[PDB]
Design a protein around this nucleic acid. Structure first.
Ligand SMILES: OC[C@H]1O[C@H](O[C@H]2[C@H](O)[C@@H](O)[C@@H](O)O[C@@H]2CO)[C@H](O)[C@@H](O)[C@@H]1O
Ligand SMILES: OC[C@H]1O[C@H](O[C@H]2[C@H](O)[C@@H](O)[C@@H](O)O[C@@H]2CO)[C@H](O)[C@@H](O)[C@@H]1O
Lengths: 437, 436
DNA sequence: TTCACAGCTGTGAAA
DNA sequence: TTCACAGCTGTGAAA
């Protein structure tokens, strides 16, 4: 797909209220006559950087703020130019989440933080620590239930426990994130991941559990607790589960530290509709009625627009969400964040599966998250150097075959021509390559 | 991984997995086994990869066409149905799920694509593909569109490619001949050229996938879509008054869908083979069980003769079977996977403009039977090149050690090769050109 | 930082 | 069928 003048195409993740956002698009079409299409393709955060480099992709992309720094360093996003008057309608810290190299590269929409979600009837008084979790699962499995199930395939859901005792992604120091100071391999992170693996070894959780499995189970009533964000509440509401949203348990006495995400809307640098996209975002979506319609579909969390957030903050689920947020940290938006997420994802999955030890899986994730990504030019330099090396050899052997008269078979490899060269120069070469004068 | 006394089930995400969950819990009551139903992504791809390591599901629900490559790799337990039991299901279902005189899965439901249309926007559905462009120009003025369907999966486009003569593997002399592929003939070309021309004239979008097609129809923005019985439940919950009818004709010929028999083969590495056959023979393929799955997302024309009597009355099933009769059952042979991939690549590359229709289908025709190199073959290659490097590395190691050439402190083997050339009375130029 | 050999697989040649 | 160089990137050495 390419962005066409006169229409808007939006990409938002499949767990967000895309139907609600589509309704906001219809009003935009009614007031101004521009068609708005909302789509939720899988792996949209990976698809966008691929297509958008060529000028393809949607007009607007929705994702947590951590992915956008990479998008901006690749020149995939337009610079956001809201008047000062409009910026003041959004909390300053949400603008910070979409600031990169001094510039605003997206519109903040809502603040997202994981929370503990528990079945009140199946578990009154939910656990306050992670350590009492195996004990609470013994009693529950008695009733044929499980204690806790959440997504183990995306490190987002495990990071709160890894960060509890001291794990961290990139150390902040002197006003910037140090991309060489990674904390996925320290004692705190090892302790968090070990306690997770010990739950699986001791059968209190299964390592194959993904988002849908963990969802299905809590909404059906087969587990007392789950870990999820505000988007998941709407589906629980329609189930026959009486649930609450509370602080995440402590680990080794310390609070769980979820990585906080700001759902943000970036404008594709190739869109011929930047003014329309800005009009749609500033004066339709980021309004009380715009966010409400999306919010009614799947809760957004703590929205960035002050006016509608003072209404949503009355909700005790949002207060809990922000209680967990306060204990965590805003995600960095630097380009290396995708490299940190890939490394930790591989680590958690390998350790959860027994394919690697915790110490080994995290040591590799530390090296991967810190790994210097070579530039296109460096890649090109390397490619050209090996191209030159082969061609020089090819010419040497091309010439050695033409003028050599080396008593060679009709077809044979360079290794044989080299052998014949060796004997002409006064060497003997065994079959295995051992060579001496 | 599998653990004895439990039952984990894999089935595609567009089927009534929750309905099978309701069936799984009643299997608990009688036999006490806890059953879980998971709907993973690309399960027809993940299964042939994870099965060797013993990782995998007890049961896989999928269309029959891929099981022949599965069974030929040894991933499924051959099925042992009583002669009574074959008689309890239609003989042509067993025929589709049989490779090499052995029964690899249990037939469950017959699936065929049909035209689904919004009566309020289109009381009379078009009988031909050719009138769809004009019909779209009409509905566009009303802010609607004529037709949207999944262009990413060739299953949905194949009916139009087959209409004017396109075929996969010509069945001749009692077997499918992989020497006779018809993805490159004039009928296939005409079928794809028309589909691309719909896109070139902005009557369809090359990027439309299953999700985009379903939303646009269920929301009433498009007047028609092409889909199977599973999609009906979501239209039901929608506010759209829909009909299910015969597919449009192309150049006066019917649309020829590939008919799939949803089958259920058994994990050759499962420790619950007969603990699961209780499910497959005496629980799922029963009138009461198929009802639970059909209640969630409709199965289509089930293979149980008993329940198909009641469901065949449904005018939607009759249309589904009306389209089925005009098409063909899919081959179940191993080359199917390579045929689907080749056709998937042709459709997408022609829809996107990346390739002309001629170039795309010409590439597909050669790929549809391309042989996958065996593991041993790959290992032969790997070992050959390992041998080649070690021989050269030993030569250059000996030259560097005993050669006493006038070489830089650190240099590549090419530099050593040159100093060995000049020693043999050759002159090597800068760029490698070499003579005596 | 640049650099060179390893390494596996791809293209297509020689049967 | 086997075979061989191409081709790009990985690992790790030497500054
Ligand atoms: O798991 C790594 C993943 O974490 C975050 O993604 C979240 C997203 O922020 C939420 O809105 C929700 O959709 O769940 C996602 C995890 O499945 C990061 O934003 C993302 O970049 C990262 O890959
Ligand atoms: O698109 C190629 C694909 O077609 C069929 O897949 C169908 C499947 O049979 C249906 O049950 C449903 O899931 O829709 C699918 C199309 O997306 C073949 O069964 C499959 O082998 C083939 O790859």
């Amino acid at each position: 797909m390419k962005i066409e003048e006169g229409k808007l195409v939006i990409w938002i993740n499949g767990d967000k209220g895309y139907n609600g956002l589509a309704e906001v698009g219809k009003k935009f079409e009614k007031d101004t006559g521009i068609k708005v299409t909302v789509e939720h393709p899988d792996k949209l955060e990976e698809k966008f950087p691929q297509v958008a480099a060529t000028g393809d992709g949607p007009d607007i992309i929705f994702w947590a703020h951590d992915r956008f720094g990479g998008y901006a360093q690749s020149g995939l996003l337009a610079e956001i130019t809201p008047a000062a008057a409009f910026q003041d309608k959004l909390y300053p810290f949400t603008w910070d989440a979409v600031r990169y190299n001094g510039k605003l590269i997206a519109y903040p929409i809502a603040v997202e933080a994981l929370s503990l979600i528990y079945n009140k009837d199946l578990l009154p008084n939910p656990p306050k620590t992670w350590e009492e979790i195996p004990a609470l699962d013994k009693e529950l499995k008695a009733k044929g239930k499980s204690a806790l199930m959440f997504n183990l395939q995306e490190p987002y859901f495990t990071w709160p426990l890894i960060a509890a005792d001291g794990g961290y992604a990139f150390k902040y120091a002197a006003g910037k994130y140090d991309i060489k100071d990674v904390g996925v391999d320290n004692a705190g992170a090892k302790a968090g991941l070990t306690f997770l693996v010990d739950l699986i070894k001791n059968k209190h959780m299964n390592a194959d559990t993904d988002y849908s499995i963990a969802e299905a189970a809590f909404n059906k009533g087969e587990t007392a607790m789950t870990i999820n964000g505000p988007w998941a509440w709407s589906n629980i509401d329609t189930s026959a589960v009486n649930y609450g949203v509370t602080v995440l348990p402590t680990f080794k006495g310390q609070p769980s530290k979820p990585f906080v995400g700001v759902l943000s809307a970036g404008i594709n640098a190739a869109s011929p509709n930047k003014e329309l996209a800005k009009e749609f975002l500033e004066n339709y979506l980021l309004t009380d009625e715009g966010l409400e319609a999306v919010n009614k579909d799947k809760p957004l969390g703590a929205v960035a627009l002050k006016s509608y957030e003072e209404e949503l903050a009355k909700d005790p689920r949002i207060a809990a969400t922000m209680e967990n947020a306060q204990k965590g940290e805003i995600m960095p938006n630097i380009p290396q964040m995708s490299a940190f997420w890939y490394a930790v994802r591989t680590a958690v999955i390998n350790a959860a599966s027994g394919r690697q030890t915790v110490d080994a899986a995290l040591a590799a994730a530390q090296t991967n998250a810190a790994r210097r990504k070579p530039s296109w030019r460096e890649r090109e330099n390397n490619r050209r150097r090996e191209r030159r090396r082969r061609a020089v050899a090819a010419k040497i052997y091309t010439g050695l075959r033409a003028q050599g008269d080396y008593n060679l078979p009709k077809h044979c490899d360079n290794n044989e021509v080299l052998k014949a060269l060796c004997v002409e120069a006064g060497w003997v070469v065994e079959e295995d390559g051992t060579t001496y004068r």
